[model samples]
Target: NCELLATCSALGYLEGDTYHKEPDCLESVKDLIRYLRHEDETRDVRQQLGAAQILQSDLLPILTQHHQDKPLFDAVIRLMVNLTQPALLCFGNLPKEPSFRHHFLQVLTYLQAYKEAFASEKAFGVLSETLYELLQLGWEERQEEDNLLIERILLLVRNILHVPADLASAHDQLLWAIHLSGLDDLLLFLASSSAEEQWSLHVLEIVSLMFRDQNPEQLAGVGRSALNVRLFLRDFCSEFLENCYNRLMGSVKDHLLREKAQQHDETYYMWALAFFMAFNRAASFRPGLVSETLSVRTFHFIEQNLTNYYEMMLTDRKEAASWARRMHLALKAYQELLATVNEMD
Candidate 1:
């Protein structure tokens, strides 16, 4: 591993904002990239060790040091793409070895931390391509038994979606990237499932972000198309509203049918409540902006389902008697909100 160590020593020296300017440094990186890009081809012991050191030792330290130099940033991203492409290509064949999974997750998390940097065309374009590849891998692998890789893919999407408003101006392209990657279906799939609470919560979080705001004028500081909350809602709010309605009713029914409430039931209940609360809060802010048709459908859905939702609350309260008072207070607050909706002109 001395040669690998030597290669990394050079990398460490050139591992700053101006690393890309060093021709010798770039050349050294390219040399390492050749070893890293084995692409399911068998690795000699040296190549394996080199890959480990480069990933575990070399890349993260450089990534951790923040800088805005484009050349350095793009070069590092390219290196990551080369290093990860093979593992991504053969992700289906890999065992869920915790050590192996941890390494990939670490790299992904590191990249995600610099999500804003990916806004640059050179950086975003490269990362987007890499994510598309990973997403496709997730689509195929989701049907299989292993969940870790798919979960990581979902987290990466969440990371990408969680950027600031300035970066979010690229929202349309970012949204399209998710759409093209086929992760949209994966998200809906995750949301529809009974378990997968983490994945489901992320889906809900993305929805919340998409419809986070309703007033376009207030979004002046934000990106026009990228963070265009109103436009996103205009396009897809109906689907989400219906989805939430169905999920709420479904959670209510599932709770009622169960012999006893369990930890899992609480997750479903809370998720449904969160969506309901968010939808109500969002609509309250810009009622006129919401489509009349969707608004009617949502109000009716709540009216029709209110009794059942209340019943679900009662059942939950009865089981967790200690929280009965808290539950009643929450229900009371919701009732006030509902009455306010009814009173609205």
Candidate 2:
């Protein structure tokens, strides 16, 4: 294709011949743009238009084949550097050379539209290097203006996931984009922005991609089954309840026979231990310094008891009073559990 196209172009430049004409030199480009812009082209015409678009893809240096000594490569690099620099670097608030700006913007627009053409093997290999140089120049000139462009380049690199393709080339391009754009810094900054503010789904997407191949089952196998599983469930439940309480009642309180999250940790701990007792199991001790009484620090109050303490309010010794009395006994047992756990800790 190259040899044929070169011959055709050369013939159009030949002297004293019928081919000596600018229209002959670039008839294919005219045909391509015309077909691409057609409003009523038939199906066959559309296919021919697609082929024409591919044939005319080389006006952008990114879509052209790379040669070690190619002057077009140097010209493209120079154009990128000039455009990325401050407008003051050029003459009269505009580029001194209109050809540079014209070609640079023209190629950018063309590649953005016919992006798949730029993704071709021959083109991307050269384009990756060209893009790297452009980023380097942009990084040195201005950073804030270049960050989003770098992310788009990362998208371009990842888009080349075809069979037998060079992943290393794509990886290099992605890494360069991340490094030049400080993407990791941005991520960490965004992540540390306080848990109260909800993180967007992108954070979860990153975590999923990062650990897609890792074995979570193997990770869970290293701990004591009964103890670890129970603790995990308990802690997860506690945290969920705390979040729920904060969003709902603004505090956990002991009401009748139940418990809420905005109470002292000891109160919840006691209630949990009572649950374990009913199942004939010994409840675990507090894992940390219980003397600090985390309930006040964390949830803002102390629930002294969740059971028998409330039962004393019952006056008539009937079925309801018996149930209230049983609840009071259970609450007392929980308080005892909290005391013993604090002593153990």
Candidate 3:
């Protein structure tokens, strides 16, 4: 793909900070976007793009410098959105053949390289500004494309954060990027923003990734028992429960009801469903504390997961322990509903 990459040399020129700065650059940039947006290719394009280091090395600098240029900036981030889509998802189901297996391993390697290159605060700082600048615009002023761009950027951030870190590295570079770049605060801001209410799914999904393998004990000791964190959480939950809980949880419940997403989609829903119901139960025994969720449909949601995860626990082989944890969450969600309904009756 060197010919293809060369066709995209506008990226290289941008990285060098010496573009011709007009019509010539747009043509090359379009060529790059074309190759990236090529439809229905079987091979994972990202593996090729990331393996050559174009994504991080060449395109990232272009993104940082060209934020004011919406067309070019959209192209750069859209390329990344396509690239950072889950590698496992890029390939359809495959047999156990050695070549296919090797291709799988190859994709993982390139993804790891992409994450490593993206771990710097320089990369994250630019992304932070991109997110916030868009956020500052009133929703009415934001075009349909602007809304989609925000989602793509969130998806990009989520995909990067979701990459599995090498255990041997010990220091998780992306999490550090999150800390140093204040992406966590940005995520929390989105989490509670009424204007961002429509994005509850994306916001919570990223927050889920943030805590996926995080250690609370470790975070507490580092942040002086994380006192401010705990206090903010308690306050946030109170407000979220009163104001956004119905919208947030109701939206998620409908997404699950639609059954469009699989795997961890259900897992994140069940875990948070259980967490919030338990919190509300202890915080207040009255049904009005979470009035919208007390309806009959909530039971249908829990029962479906209850049976779904029960079957998963029975059949799961690879991550049986993890399935067991999911089973517990579903059951707890069921029980929380039961206990609360029982308390009300």
Candidate 4:
């Protein structure tokens, strides 16, 4: 643990806020990752290894300092993905005792700190520029590593948005910060950008997270709040409805058909439906805006998952509660589909 900490001296402001990248330090970071992975004392080791400390003082600064530096940026972000893995995924198996709760809470506190720290305009800029640069290179111009790197950056953003903050204000402020950082616009473009289609599932995952704790109304709320959101509304346009929505969900419908058993991401698809079906019904009625999803094929996709989720709810002992939520979301999707279907009658 101290080895990783010591190697970070490769980072120094000894010369006017400038620091050198340490290639040798990559091994230490890797060791930290392996330890966090294979060890049962993960909760204790994370702190002793300065997980939170290194993120703010060392890893984040390394990221803030540069991109495409190869070892450091790539290594740190891979570590971050492991570090920021959700509590359920990371600790779902642990026995729920006071000791477990105490440890879990401390890790959550560290994650919260990470969330707030990276929500800044500065951090958003770094992430945004990297994404832009990643795409700037032509398909043949970059190697497989670039594409993998693209996924990691998308994931890091998802992980940040995945962090839960209790306050509605904190959530809204993060939205505001994202909008102000121009990331909001970037995401909209990326979601639909033709060249970016390779990452559609990944981008849509982030989109669902962006809207996760958000209401379609607040999202659809026009530009004029009493406080004024500075400028522009998070308005719902027909362009995004017909263009992005149709293209992306069609891809998802096919993808889920092919890969459903492996991914277990029907919840996200259900989540999208729970939102979009509601959004389409609430908005100006243009049935064609969702022609792809309005079909029998898509209907069966939702219907099958609806039944499966219901069964999982009844059956899975520990995950019964989790399945219940997916079941509810699938119901909402099915509900909206019913309204539209009968309108055809």
Highest TM-score model number = 4
Question: Each candidate: what lDDT?
Answer: 0.45, 0.34, 0.65, 0.68
Error of 2 at 330 (Å): 45
Candidate 1 CA-lDDT value: 0.45
**Model 3 TM-score on a 0 to 1 scale:** 0.72
TM-score of each: 0.37, 0.23, 0.72, 0.85
Local accuracy of candidate 4 as per-residue lDDT tens digits, 255-301: 77777577746566677766776667666558887787788887887
Clashes of each: 1, 3, 0, 0
Total colliding residue pairs, candidate 3: 0
Instruction: Write candidate 2's Cα lDDT for 113-178 as tens digits.
Output: 343333344444454554445445623474543544444333333232211111033323323333
Error of 1 at 147 (Å): 1.4
Q: Which lDDT value does model 2 have at 17?
A: 23
Query: By lDDT, highest first, what's the ranking?
Result: 4, 3, 1, 2
* Candidate 2: clashing pairs of residues: 252-262, 307-328, 308-328
Task: Point to the candidate with the largest lDDT.
Answer: 4
Query: How many clashes in candidate 1?
Result: 1
Model 3, range 1-345, lDDT digits (tens) per residue? 665766555454442554334445546666766766663444545556656777766677667665677787787787777677665666654426887677766766776677777878877888888778888899889989888888988988877866743111312566667667777667767765666766777776775565454333233233221444444445545555665656666666665666565533666666565566667776653556576567798788678767776787778766566667777877866776788779776
**Which has the better lDDT: candidate 1, or candidate 3?**
3
lDDT of 1 by residue, 140-174 (tens): 45543234434444444454555432103455555
Flag regions of model 2 displaced more than 4 Å.
1-31, 39-46, 49-62, 66-122, 139-345
